[model samples]
Target: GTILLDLAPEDKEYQSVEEEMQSTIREHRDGGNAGGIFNRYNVIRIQKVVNKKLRERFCHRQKEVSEENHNHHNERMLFHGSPFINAIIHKGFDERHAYIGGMFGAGIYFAENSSKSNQYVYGIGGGTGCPTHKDRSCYICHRQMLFCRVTLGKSFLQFSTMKMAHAPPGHHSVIGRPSVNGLAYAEYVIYRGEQAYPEYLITYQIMKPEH
Candidate 1:
């Protein structure tokens, strides 16, 4: 059964993490293209709603709480962090390596009779935050910012404090995933105009694995 967990925004630990993530995002943004050692691709905006959900999910599993009770607590906790959570949730996004480590162990799960879908099967959504006003829509913030993905090889690994830089026109770099063995990739850059935001394609590819 699926369970929900709740995190109080007033909680000191959550606040500390939020601030640290925000600082990381801002450092990347201000550095721009010249920001050596600190790259834009590594910095991302995480939505608060998403972060809260992730916290609850983690808590549920850790505490062995039932799904029904978890859901109830989740609803109540929303208001606890509504002010702070709504504002800086997406200010800058970073994933806890511990969280990803847990997910990696879970692999993929499916119902006994369910059919396979074309899309890749992986856990999605977790702690996310952004640097913006609480009253504004995060969609705008996301559209304005730049994003990139990193992969590394089997032996290499990185956790917090990993420094990165923007790759050349057609390349990616992560801590532990092999560079030449990428599965697939895409990136989009959004530009603001008078009426609508236009998106520019930056890179796209389906790389074959190296033997």
Candidate 2:
């Protein structure tokens, strides 16, 4: 099941992974995208709600995409740090060395399903809307080649810190997953407009511990 921080939001005290996913399904209801409205405000409410829950759970430290990876983040981008995590789209096999959405083991799932479908994918609402390389929708996105770096710290794995974010001088919460073959953790920075914090949705994987 999915795990999270100990803190709680006003009405969002997620009790368990099961409860969290149920809420994610309700959150996505009709807010997901077909062709995707990258910065489209109305269509991303579900994601925003999810981010809110995560913010408190995550350590204040941040992970960022490095311009250092070799990539296919094309069109308006320089061809690296592309947002399509899990190395999908025209961003082929060559760049899987550095994918970083934090959730792609089932990447295609959310790309195809929606909240109205009454399903919760990895517990974070239909993510960025998965699309294959050739899909025309692949040409449009806010993602860049995501080669995240320990911008602030030296490091420790997520397992070492118990998933709680650590110091800025090392790899913190959510560690480095995605394409490093650790775990899938796709990030979604949600802009909810004024008065609210910009929600950072770091959707990760759910797994059983080593037996």
Candidate 3:
């Protein structure tokens, strides 16, 4: 018969596993702008809100194995760390148009002695509709909130091949250029040793000035 559980939290095996995972996360977050890397943007303020809806949604779908009843795991995962940074726009121009952008790039490697690894990154953006008439005198128009998520993994070798639909086609996709009224909400999740980690939630809002 084989023992199925280990009661020691300080065991060498557990320690090694945790260390490996941390290292992997670090490498991915600091790779650079080319991959798993993030750009630096000026922020004005940071805001937080409780996502009760998301929590309930996750609990409703939690699995129950056999006769064991498991309490709903508070999926309030940390929302910061790694390559994804947070910023608030407080002093930017007050225009009728707004936009959102994101990029991911970096590689992941195995712990211990391994010669294999994986690379991934992505970029995308979108916003409200442009004015009917393209003229300087046109009034400010509000557009729907636009956002995008793209992924570039091992098999993905080309950036164009992994373009996000939310982002318009072109190199300027990551650029914050759109016809909207505000920026999209950004959330970050960071690991905090224990499973019960904290999450960082931030909202980015942009609006035009009144004449």
Best by lDDT: 2
Q: Report the error of model 2 at residue 109, Å.
A: 21
lDDT of 2 at 207: 21
Q: How well does model 3 score by local distance difference test?
A: 0.22
Better of 1 and 2 by TM-score: 1
Give the alpha carbon lDDT tens digit for every residue of 1-211 in model 1.
2121333457664454334433332222222221112212221222223344434444443232223233321211100111122222333122211122332211111111001100111112211322352212122222211111111111112232123322122221122232344311211111101101111111111112234
Candidates sorted by TM-score, best first: 3, 1, 2
lDDT of each: 0.21, 0.24, 0.22
| lDDT, candidate 3, 56-147, per-residue tens | 33233332211122333323222222112211111111111222223321111011201001111011211111235332111232211101
Clashes of each: 23, 23, 18
Off-target runs (Cα >4 Å) in candidate 3 are 1-31, 35-43, 63-199, 203-211
List TM-score per model, in order: 0.21, 0.19, 0.22
State the TM-score for model 1.
0.21
lDDT of 2 by residue, 1-211 (tens): 1222333333253233223332433233233332321221111111222233333322222222112212211111001112333332122223123223443221111111122222122123434343334222232322211112112222223322222322234221122323454423322211111111222122322121233
Candidate 1 residue 179 Cα shift, in angstroms, is 13
